[PDB]
């Protein structure tokens, strides 16, 4: 069990006691939610025959769990003598929002799992096999993964790699294959600077057949230093949280309006974009969510009556601002020089354009100054 | 366009601020057309979307003519009132500080 098990009684005069008598205070254990969030997987529609990837990817999954949070709302919710499930009871909705944040946190644990193995297997591992002492001649090789000793040390090294494999298994995924993603991929819309390094990471385990976490390692761009390239991703992460707060209001109000009015197309094309920054040993190895198809930049000259222009006007009037995305026209190709100073519309979907995400919102808040581009006015300010 | 001569000869207050209101209404009409000249010169209708560009110029003009902020008093004394002198022919720059006809 270890669950609430039908939150009933609670009649407003019960006691200060009888609250701590029938409840846990992990009210939902982190086993019950994860044995029904794998239902949010195999029950789903549009799975064709067996082939899902983008549907089961955590980018899409946390969005549909958000579309289940917005569904049947608070004002008509009822507690107490509502033992029948599948109705608008608060026990259902606290169960539903706990699925939403568990989808975000499961992305976060896989985030820090992928994070450590990028920076150790390709950067800090060629110089970790030896070279503890710098008074001895320190000759560390350059990282090419990015583009006879005594018997006692040898046997304790075999003990080291065998025991660290136990660390790499169990809690973490049971080892993972890597891809290097050379500097011509159209995933460069995820990329800001020319000297950044991309790393797809599959599961290489039984998993839930999802895998697909790509990461970007910050290194700089010529006169932009490595601290500059890292910190601009940092203000990017802290800025997407605020638009994530404006956008979950867009799910809420458009869902509330479309439910109550039409109980007598898609839900919203401004879906929530999930990221995680790390700050391990010396680098920030920020991880995105991998799309099944290529990201294409959307031109902002758009129909007035279209969906994307319509509910961007709601997100805008909440943020107390003006036009975020400038008028852009995107024929094809890239430039890779003079890094893009404007926010863009990524449109991550194999299907019709009913799921877009925002990116480069760091270049929407001004450069502040009094001119270095890490120093910005704060997004919440 | 000869309302400026009436403003000098009007003695009563209701006729004075009515002519003054008419000249300032025609003034913001002329500065809206002057800014519209800039937006047709700089060929912006090819890049920025047209009708909302018209709307954001209108709400910028109304917030800068009617206002309780310092940008309103600076915009009046520098652009609106000197343009009143050229099209209505009276030099009223310096005596019609914006808390005189600020009413709706």
């Amino acid at each position: 069990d270890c669950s609430i098990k039908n939150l009933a009684s609670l009649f407003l005069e019960t006691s200060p006691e009888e609250m701590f008598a029938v409840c846990p205070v992990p009210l939902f254990s982190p086993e019950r939610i994860f044995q029904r969030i794998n239902a949010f997987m195999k029950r789903g529609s549009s799975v064709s025959e067996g082939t899902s990837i983008w549907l089961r990817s955590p980018q899409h999954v946390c969005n549909k769990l958000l579309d289940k949070v917005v569904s049947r709302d608070i004002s008509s919710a009822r507690v107490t003598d509502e033992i029948d499930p599948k109705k608008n009871t608060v026990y259902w909705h606290i169960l539903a929002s706990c699925q939403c944040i568990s989808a975000s946190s499961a992305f976060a644990f896989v985030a820090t799992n992928t994070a450590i193995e990028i920076i150790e297997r390709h950067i800090y591992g060629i110089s970790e096999d030896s070279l503890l002492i710098g008074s001895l001649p320190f000759d560390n090789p350059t990282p090419s993964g990015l583009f006879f000793v005594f018997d006692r040390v040898e046997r304790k090294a075999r003990e080291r790699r065998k025991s660290l494999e136990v660390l790499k298994r169990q809690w973490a995924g049971g080892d993972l294959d890597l891809c290097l993603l050379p500097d011509n991929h159209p995933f460069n819309v995820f990329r800001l600077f020319k000297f950044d390094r991309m790393f797809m990471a599959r599961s290489r385990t039984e998993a839930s057949s999802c895998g697909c976490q790509l990461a970007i390692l910050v290194l700089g761009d010529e006169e932009h230093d490595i601290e500059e390239a890292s910190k601009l991703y940092g203000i990017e992460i802290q800025a997407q949280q605020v638009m994530n707060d404006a956008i979950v209001e867009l799910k809420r109000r458009s869902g509330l309006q479309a439910e109550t009015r039409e109980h007598s197309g898609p839900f919203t094309v401004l879906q929530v974009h999930l990221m995680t920054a790390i700050d391990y040993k010396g680098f920030r190895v920020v991880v995105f969510s991998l799309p099944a198809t290529v990201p294409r930049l959307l031109n902002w000259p758009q129909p007035v009556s279209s969906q994307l222009s319509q509910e961007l006007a709601f997100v805008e009037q909440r943020l107390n601002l003006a036009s975020l995305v400038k008028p852009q026209t995107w024929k094809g190709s890239v430039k890779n020089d003079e890094i893009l100073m404007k926010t863009v519309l990524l449109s991550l979907d194999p299907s019709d354009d009913d799921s877009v995400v925002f990116y480069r919102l760091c270049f929407a808040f001004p450069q502040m100054d009094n001119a270095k581009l890490c120093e910005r006015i704060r997004c919440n300010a | 366009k000869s309302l400026g001569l009436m403003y000098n000869r009007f003695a009563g207050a209701v006729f004075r601020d009515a002519s003054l209101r008419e000249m300032l209404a025609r003034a913001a009409k002329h500065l809206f057309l002057k800014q519209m000249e800039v937006l047709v010169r700089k060929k912006a209708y090819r890049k920025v979307l047209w009708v909302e560009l018209l709307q954001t110029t209108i709400v910028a003009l109304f917030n800068i003519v009617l206002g309780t902020t310092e940008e309103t008093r600076s915009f009046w004394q520098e652009q609106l009132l000197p343009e009143v002198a050229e099209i209505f022919g009276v030099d009223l720059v310096g005596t019609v500080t914006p808390r005189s006809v600020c009413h709706p």
Binding site: V304, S305, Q310, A313 | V51, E52, L54, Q55, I58
Partner: peptide, 27 residues
């Protein structure tokens, strides 16, 4: 919906000021 807001057309047509309807009321 967000394409018609604000502006309305001011039309200044050519009612002739010599018709019998205007001339009777003016005089």
């Amino acid at each position: 919906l967000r394409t018609f807001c604000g502006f309305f057309p001011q039309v200044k047509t050519v009612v002739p000021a010599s018709l019998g309807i205007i001339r009777t009321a003016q005089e």
